[PDB]
UniProtKB/Swiss-Prot annotation, chain A:
<dbReference type="GO" id="GO:0045899">
    <property type="term" value="P:positive regulation of RNA polymerase II transcription preinitiation complex assembly"/>
</dbReference>
<dbReference type="GO" id="GO:0031625">
    <property type="term" value="F:ubiquitin protein ligase binding"/>
</dbReference>
<dbReference type="GO" id="GO:0005634">
    <property type="term" value="C:nucleus"/>
</dbReference>
<dbReference type="GO" id="GO:0016887">
    <property type="term" value="F:ATP hydrolysis activity"/>
</dbReference>
<dbReference type="GO" id="GO:0005524">
    <property type="term" value="F:ATP binding"/>
</dbReference>
<keyword id="KW-0647">Proteasome</keyword>
<dbReference type="GO" id="GO:0036402">
    <property type="term" value="F:proteasome-activating activity"/>
</dbReference>
UniProtKB/Swiss-Prot annotation, chain B:
<protein>
    <recommendedName>
        <fullName>26S proteasome regulatory subunit 6A</fullName>
    </recommendedName>
</protein>
<comment type="function">
    <text>The 26S proteasome is involved in the ATP-dependent degradation of ubiquitinated proteins. The regulatory (or ATPase) complex confers ATP dependency and substrate specificity to the 26S complex.</text>
</comment>
<feature type="modified residue" description="Phosphotyrosine">
    <location>
        <position position="6"/>
    </location>
</feature>
<feature type="binding site">
    <location>
        <begin position="48"/>
        <end position="55"/>
    </location>
    <ligand>
        <name>ATP</name>
    </ligand>
</feature>
<comment type="similarity">
    <text>Belongs to the AAA ATPase family.</text>
</comment>
UniProtKB/Swiss-Prot annotation, chain C:
<protein>
    <recommendedName>
        <fullName>26S proteasome regulatory subunit 6A</fullName>
    </recommendedName>
</protein>
<comment type="function">
    <text>The 26S proteasome is involved in the ATP-dependent degradation of ubiquitinated proteins. The regulatory (or ATPase) complex confers ATP dependency and substrate specificity to the 26S complex.</text>
</comment>
<comment type="similarity">
    <text>Belongs to the AAA ATPase family.</text>
</comment>
Length: 361, 174, 45
């Protein structure tokens, strides 16, 4: 008859579990009685206690303040929380217009490590001193009396060195990775490139530890002749706005602007002048000594034979980064099925060269 | 599971050799690639004139592995309100859950796949967010051979190295 | 059969305390939810 004591502790847990489940139901009942609010952005600052806003759910309104209003973080052009009845501002919201978390890629710190960018150490060491230092300790250059550079141009073959150097710099520094390609700028719209740079500048203003990266900037550049617009609407608005942000009254000291293209001669020399872009860095192809450490990441991670020779496929490899070797090891598995082996061979990896040589030169 | 074979349309064996290698082999038996640790490709880029076998061998490759045929039309991916075609990325993935295998097709990739020199994907957000949802869904199952995404169109203009890798559309099959 | 019946009555009665507590909550949680639901999409969680 004493065996029922084991069920006493088991049933008592169910009494405590159901009591917590029924309590969460009452909390959901009390949560439905809550009243939400609206959202908008300040169009104009009339005074300190009055802000001209624009409602997303209705026409333009002019609202007041309620409580916990920080006048430093809240100013003209900042997203607010509108009231449906009294038309007041309650909560302060960050500035967002376009899908900055969709059209723009934002990731915490970096992804790609230093082992993939290896071989550039001589150049990277000089770049980290003018980039990593002002982001960590801004007082280094203040005692010297100089200013850190803003734009840094990384150019080379498409897909080679553009993705690696983008996520590697943000990984060693600790700043967030911002990917905003130049292909999201020039379109058919009224003032698209005007609001892309402003919202991109607003995101870097809210979060200081961030670095902006771009891609394929050759389409948004060019000097034309007199540096005006002829049958290109969105190119000139991009050329001038990028010049006024860095050389204006408010620049990004905690955010560096990065561009990527095939050649620097295809851009507008107006943006290549000192004061904005101070650095031109060419991305070459990795040599036999440079590619030795490339195949040691992805190819060395997958299961391979102990006698596998790395140097056998390096001489036949041309311009293969950490992303390109994923396909080389993948294409090597197709030719290794005929040999009935659970691993890869150095001669089977060399068979992925001529297969790619049919497309690329 | 459409009903088709490779003998119904002949003369494409030159292209079929590239299709079976990048579709049937990584899907049917994945135990050869999983023992090596490498990731099998989930798709191959296809381009060519209409009626040349790009849409003809679509159901053929799905019938060999017994997979569900899902076709995405280009005019169906552009709407007014944000939604519709943008949800088809999750809709085609929703049918992939219950059904054991899957193969996803995209007709006329050049509509949503070619940005040219224009950002107009920002103008109509159903086109851009469709490509954005693909990057999240293609990275959902890395080692699963039962989720495949394919596309077919006329030509190829804009290249996206972020889309070129194992597990996405990479190899160009003309 | 003897000691177990003493503690079982306490747990059985406390289970009835939350039973009458959820009985009024089941009527509220179903009625407070609006049956003509409107289509909406959350932009940011």
């Amino acid at each position: 008859h004493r065996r029922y004591d084991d069920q006493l502790k088991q049933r008592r847990q169910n009494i405590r579990d159901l009591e917590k489940l029924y309590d969460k139901t009452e909390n959901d009942i009390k949560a439905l009685q809550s009243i939400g609010q609206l959202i908008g952005e300040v169009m104009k600052e009339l005074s300190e206690e009055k802000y001209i806003v624009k409602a997303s759910s209705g026409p333009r309104y002019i609202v007041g303040v309620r409580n916990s209003v920080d006048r430093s973080k809240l100013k003209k052009g900042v997203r607010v929380t509108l009231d449906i009845t009294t038309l007041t501002i309650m909560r302060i919201l960050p500035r967002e217009t376009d899908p900055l978390v969709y059209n723009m890629t934002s990731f915490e710190q970096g992804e790609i490590t230093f082992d993939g960018i290896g071989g550039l150490t001589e150049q990277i060491r000089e770049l980290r001193e003018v980039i990593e230092l002002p982001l960590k300790n801004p007082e280094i250059f203040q005692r010297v009396g100089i200013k850190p550079p803003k734009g840094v141009l990384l150019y080379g073959p498409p897909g080679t060195g553009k993705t690696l150097l983008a996520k590697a710099v943000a990984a060693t520094i600790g700043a967030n990775f911002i990917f905003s390609p130049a292909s999201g700028i020039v379109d058919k719209y009224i003032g698209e490139s005007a609001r892309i740079i402003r919202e991109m500048f607003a995101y870097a203003k809210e979060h200081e530890p961030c670095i902006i990266f771009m891609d394929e900037v050759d389409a948004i550049g060019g000097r034309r002749f007199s540096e005006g617009t002829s049958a290109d609407r969105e190119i000139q608005r991009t050329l001038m706005e990028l010049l006024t942000q860095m050389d204006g009254f408010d620049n990004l000291g905690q955010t560096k602007i990065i561009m990527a293209t095939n050649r620097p001669d295809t851009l507008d020399p107006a943006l290549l002048r000192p004061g904005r872009l101070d650095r031109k860095v060419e991305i070459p192809l990795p040599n036999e000594a440079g590619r030795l450490e490339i195949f040691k990441i992805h190819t060395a991670k997958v299961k391979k034979t102990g006698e596998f020779d790395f140097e056998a496929a390096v001489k036949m490899s041309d311009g293969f980064n950490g992303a390109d070797i994923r396909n080389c090891a993948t294409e090597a598995g197709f030719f290794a099925i005929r040999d009935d082996r659970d691993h890869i061979n150095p001669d089977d990896l060399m068979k992925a060269v001529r297969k790619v040589a049919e497309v690329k030169k | 599971k459409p009903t088709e074979t490779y003998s119904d349309v002949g003369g494409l064996d030159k292209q079929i050799e590239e299709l079976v290698e990048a579709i049937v082999l990584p899907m049917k038996r994945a135990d050869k690639f999983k023992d090596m640790g490498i990731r099998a490709p989930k798709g191959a880029l296809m381009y060519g004139p209409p009626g040349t076998g790009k849409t003809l061998l679509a159901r053929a490759c799905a019938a060999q592995t017994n997979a569900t045929f899902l076709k995405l039309a280009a005019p169906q991916l552009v709407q007014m309100y944000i939604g519709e075609g943008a949800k088809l990325v999750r809709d085609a993935f929703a049918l992939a859950k219950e059904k054991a295998p899957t193969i996803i097709f995209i007709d006329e990739l050049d509509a949503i796949g070619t940005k040219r020199f224009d950002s107009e994907k920002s103008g109509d957000r159903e086109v851009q967010r469709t490509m954005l949802e693909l990057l999240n869904q293609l990275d959902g199952f890395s080692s699963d051979d039962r989720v495949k995404v394919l596309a077919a169109t006329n030509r190829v203009d804009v290249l996206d190295p972020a889309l070129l890798r194992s597990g996405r559309l990479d190899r160009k099959i003309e | 059969i003897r000691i177990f019946r003493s503690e079982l009555q306490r747990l059985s009665h406390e289970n009835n305390v939350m039973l009458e507590k959820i009985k009024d909550n089941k009527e509220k949680i179903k009625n407070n939810r609006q049956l003509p639901y409107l289509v909406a999409n959350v932009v940011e969680v």
